[PDB]
Structure formats: C-alpha cells, structure tokens
Design a protein around this motif. Structure first.
Motif, PDB file in Angstrom:
ATOM      1  N   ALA A 148      18.714  64.695  34.183  1.00  0.00           N
ATOM      2  CA  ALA A 148      19.276  65.197  34.617  1.00  0.00           C
ATOM      3  C   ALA A 148      20.939  64.309  33.414  1.00  0.00           C
TER       4      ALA A 148
ATOM      5  N   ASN B  87      29.313  59.851  36.741  1.00  0.00           N
ATOM      6  CA  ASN B  87      28.433  60.135  37.857  1.00  0.00           C
ATOM      7  C   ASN B  87      26.924  61.050  38.398  1.00  0.00           C
ATOM      8  N   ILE B  88      26.569  61.038  38.310  1.00  0.00           N
ATOM      9  CA  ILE B  88      25.315  62.240  38.661  1.00  0.00           C
ATOM     10  C   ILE B  88      25.200  61.948  39.879  1.00  0.00           C
ATOM     11  N   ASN B  89      25.211  62.882  41.037  1.00  0.00           N
ATOM     12  CA  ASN B  89      23.899  62.832  42.331  1.00  0.00           C
ATOM     13  C   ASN B  89      24.243  61.973  42.765  1.00  0.00           C
ATOM     14  N   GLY B  90      25.443  61.403  41.996  1.00  0.00           N
ATOM     15  CA  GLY B  90      25.698  59.947  43.070  1.00  0.00           C
ATOM     16  C   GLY B  90      25.546  59.012  42.645  1.00  0.00           C
ATOM     17  N   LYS B  91      25.116  58.315  41.613  1.00  0.00           N
ATOM     18  CA  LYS B  91      24.337  58.049  40.625  1.00  0.00           C
ATOM     19  C   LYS B  91      24.844  57.436  39.594  1.00  0.00           C
ATOM     20  N   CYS B  93      26.983  57.372  35.288  1.00  0.00           N
ATOM     21  CA  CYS B  93      26.052  57.196  34.693  1.00  0.00           C
ATOM     22  C   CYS B  93      26.483  55.970  33.425  1.00  0.00           C
ATOM     23  N   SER B 114      21.993  58.975  34.179  1.00  0.00           N
ATOM     24  CA  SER B 114      21.546  57.807  35.434  1.00  0.00           C
ATOM     25  C   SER B 114      20.720  56.622  34.862  1.00  0.00           C
TER      26      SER B 114
END
Ligand SMILES: [Mg+2]
Ligand SMILES: [Mg+2]
Ligand SMILES: [Zn+2]
Ligand SMILES: [Zn+2]
Ligand SMILES: [Zn+2]
Ligand SMILES: [Zn+2]
Lengths: 162, 162
Positions: A148, B87-91, B93, B114
């Motif tokens: 992702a 961030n992505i999906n709460g993670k 970057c 991530s």
DNA sequence: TTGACTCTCTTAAGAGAGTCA
DNA sequence: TTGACTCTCTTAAGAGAGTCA
C-alpha cells in the motif's frame, strides 16, 4: 553444563506439555490461490500456561527446568533446537515461526535460522506460490502482496535519471 | 515549512543540492537471471555533505532549512514526500529505498510506504523475477534466496501434526 | 523446585532532537 | 544562519536475567 541426554529429557518434557495445549485449526493461504490447513498448539492467553512456562513479555515466554538444584531457562520456542548449532554464517540462530502465530508452540511449525531469514518469510509467496526457501514455508507470508504505497519515485525538476 | 509554496521551496532546494552528489553506477540483479543499471546520487562519506545536510548517525542524515527565522529539519530521504499523507491505514509512512543503498538520495530510487512494505522489499525476487509490488521494485532484494536454515521443523515424539 | 511477574537487550529497515562554534 | 557532531527513539521479528514466596 547439561549432558546431551539431559537436554533430550528437557526437549521431551517440553513436547509433552506443549502437546496438551489447545489445538486450533487454522485455514491459511498457500499461494497460487490455494487454501491449506494448519494445526497450532496455542499457549494460553494468561496464567497458568503450563508446567515450566512463564510469560516475560506481551508475546514472549520462557521455559524453565531445574536440574541438580541449578535453574535453567530457554526462550519458549527455542527448546526444539537445543542440540543444534546456535549460529550460522556468523549470525545467531532464532526460532522462526513458520505458522506466523506467536502463541503457537507446535515444533512442526518452527525452524532454526538467522533473524534476516526469519523475517523474510513474512513476505514469501508461499509453498504453492513460488517459495524458494530450502526449508520450505508452510504458508504464504501475511505481508505478501501488492503493498500500500502512498507515493512512488518522483522529482519536480529534471536533476535526476534513474 | 508550513505553506504550499514553502514546502515546494524546500523540495526544490533539496533536489538541487542532491542533484550535485557524485553519481555512482551500480549493476544489479533484476531477477529472472537478468541484470540492470542504476544511477545513485550518493551523499559524501564525511563532512561537508552539502548545503543543508548533516549526519546524525552512521547511515542517517537530516536536511535542515531556516524559514522565517525558524529552523525546520527532516529525515534526509523524506523531503520528496513532504506533501504526501504521513501515514497509511494508521501506519507511519517511511522513505523506502528501492536501490538498497542508504547513502543514495536519488528521489527516483525512493517511495513512501509503511515500514512493513519497506522491509519486505529486501526479499523481493525483483522486477524480472515476479515482483508484485504496486510500485514496482527497481531490483531483486539483497536478501532474496533459499536462505541458510540450520534445522527445520521436527519432533521427538508423536504428539504433533502439521 | 516452581509459578507469576518485572525489566532491559538485539537487528536492521527508519526517525526526532540537543550541543556547540 | 549554516555546519558538524552527539544521544535516544520506533517497529516487529526474536532474546537473557532478577525478585519473591
Ligand atoms: Mg517469523
Ligand atoms: Mg528499504
Ligand atoms: Zn502454528
Ligand atoms: Zn518461503
Ligand atoms: Zn540509488
Ligand atoms: Zn518487489
């Protein structure tokens, strides 16, 4: 310290106790679109865990055995390999969880290798998707896939060339 | 710094300076028994590194700029992605280095993803070996291979099943 | 001899922030 | 303002060792 015969006894008692752990059937991706089944012997979520086991971290446990009044302790997943070399290519050997299920202590779901080799399996395509590990993976890595990515290689000017 | 114009300014000056780092050619495995060529813009080994850059670790550097008398500082490889979601999906970057050459700062060798996707590229077979990363790898990961397992899954008795 | 907790450490991909000159 | 160092933190795969009854 302990003789090889004594280590064997430790391994035997470890197997006997883990063997009585709740056995949970899990269906997993094998890669290539195939579906498989794994049977994990899971350590309890809280005390008691079983004879000789104690939790030292959120997902970390140790196995303890006293022999001739001297206490001995090992990482909970390391017992199966007590008679194997503990390093290779100058790297420490680690219990590599083939089922990717930490609480599981099924020895048939573990191998003994370096941390880099261990980690890598998280992204392997699986035994049916092209895994090239000599000691084959049991399932596809949880993190395998397209990923992702938020943004790819880019530049505003023309200062660069790939 | 804060405004759009200001960030673009940070990015533009960063590319300018990095655009003058010595360009080093590296021939790499692409997978499928094929080989390719990459051009890395490598930051010097010792000071001076270039306008705005300073070393905070063996293979870690930071880019620094003074905007309106206030000092701003980022991770040396993060500048290209200043406008992207952090961030992505709460993670979180992270600057993922496609060329696996830390000193390189070529934005065309970086992506924003991530930490998990970042790490996973170390074991990817490569752009010609079956890479499935949405944002394609530039080369086969350095850790891809059969591995070196010291011992595979095994049990002494008969209490377990795969 | 044991069980149930506690605390800090290792790696290798990545980071934040302070001290001087 | 810009340069050159210094020290510690994050994450997720894995570890060793102390206290007390
Ligand atoms: Mg693992
Ligand atoms: Mg990387
Ligand atoms: Zn399992
Ligand atoms: Zn594999
Ligand atoms: Zn590069
Ligand atoms: Zn890839």
């Amino acid at each position: 310290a302990l003789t090889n015969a004594q280590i064997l006894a430790v391994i035997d008692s470890w197997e006997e106790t883990v063997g009585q752990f709740p056995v949970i059937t899990h269906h997993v991706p094998l890669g290539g679109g195939l579906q498989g089944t794994l049977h994990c012997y899971e350590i309890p979520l809280a005390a008691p865990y079983g004879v000789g086991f104690a939790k030292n971290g959120p997902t970390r446990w140790q196995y303890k055995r006293t022999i001739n009044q001297v206490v001995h302790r090992w990482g909970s997943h390391t017992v199966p390999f007590l008679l194997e070399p503990d390093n290779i290519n100058g790297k420490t050997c680690t219990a590599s969880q083939l089922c990717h299920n930490t609480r599981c202590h099924n020895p048939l779901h573990l191998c003994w290798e370096s941390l880099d080799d261990n980690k890598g399996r998280n992204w392997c395509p699986g035994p049916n998707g092209g895994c090239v590990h000599a000691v084959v993976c049991l399932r596809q890595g949880p993190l395998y896939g397209p990923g992702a990515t938020v943004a790819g290689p880019q530049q505003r000017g023309s200062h660069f060339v790939v």
